[PDB]
Paper text:
Against this background, we recently identified a novel class of p38α MAPK (mitogen-activated protein kinase) binders addressing a C-terminal lipophilic binding pocket (LP) accessible for small molecules located at several angstroms distance from the enzymes active site. The discovered 2-arylquinazolines bind to the LP and their corresponding co-crystal structures revealed a very distinct binding mode of these lipid pocket ligands (LiPoLis) to p38α. Here, we present a structure-based design, synthesis, and validation by surface plasmon resonance (SPR) analysis and protein X-ray crystallography of novel LiPoLis that target the LP in p38α MAPK. A series of six complex crystal structures showed that the designed LiPoLis indeed target the LP of p38α MAPK and validated our design approaches.
Author numbering: 5 to 30, 35 to 116, 122 to 168, 184 to 353
Amino acid sequence: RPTFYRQELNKTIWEVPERYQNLSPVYGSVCAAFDTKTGLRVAVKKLSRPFQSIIHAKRTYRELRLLKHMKHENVIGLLDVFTPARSLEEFNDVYLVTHLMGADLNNILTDDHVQFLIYQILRGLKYIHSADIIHRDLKPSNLAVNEDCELKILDATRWYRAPEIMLNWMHYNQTVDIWSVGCIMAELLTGRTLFPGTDHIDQLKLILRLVGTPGAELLKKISSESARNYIQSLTQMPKMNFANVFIGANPLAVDLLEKMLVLDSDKRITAAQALAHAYFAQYHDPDDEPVADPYDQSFESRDLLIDEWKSLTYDEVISFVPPPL
Ligand SMILES: Nc1ccc2c(NCc3ccc(F)cc3)nc(-c3ccccc3)nc2c1
């Protein structure tokens, strides 16, 4: 049990172990800090109102469980989790400590940079997807890149969302993330957002303008009559030739985009399949693209009181084991 020191940052009081020094500000508030134990720069996130409602309390619990499970080089992992509280009764504040990453992918490329960056994302997604976890919100601001161009996955928003999440299909799979990667890859190659839509309707028109309106083989798999009516109403756009839209790009890169930006998610390439694509021949190492331990998601289907979620979160703070140096 370490000793804590109080401090006021951006009109909030931070109580953190003395082990973390020189706090500097950057869902919750985040501070950069120096960690005297590892000698490394860290990010300390103080959650805001972590147990205000059932939804917050479950969301706090979910976030701690996910971070505690991620042990992979291209996914953000948990260095430490702590509370100033000495008991469950006083437990009201949760802090999360992770590696401070240099910048996000948003604020920044040759084809070799794009290969390395997209390769690291797919490698992280393979790990995440193997544990039955879907990210659902992949976008450049959720991708941290240091000076070495080493990338970690963290955590408009609509520009990277899969068409089946736009239409609220209840049974989408992991490939909603592959769609996002496709949109990201296309932005890195061209400098431009692929689908910069102003709202949900406009967003889908821009998508269908590139990938074409869906054929009868995809229509026969849509369960919502209203969605089916809507889709068939809109004007028939032809599938464009990616080799023309992405003119001058590496043709292996165009080929991967065509396999990622597929409307039908049953036919969209997976992260593991994409890792073996020729586009990543330089980097692909099948002996060095691990999968994750199983992840118990059964709590997602539970309806519990705020104090029960809080209690379950307290247990996970106590049982936390720091990763090895
Ligand atoms: N097996 C599959 C494969 C893809 C599906 C899918 N793709 C999203 C989509 C978006 C736009 C469009 F024009 C055509 C399809 N949506 C839906 C769906 C279901 C209910 C409500 C809305 C979308 N079910 C699917 C089932």
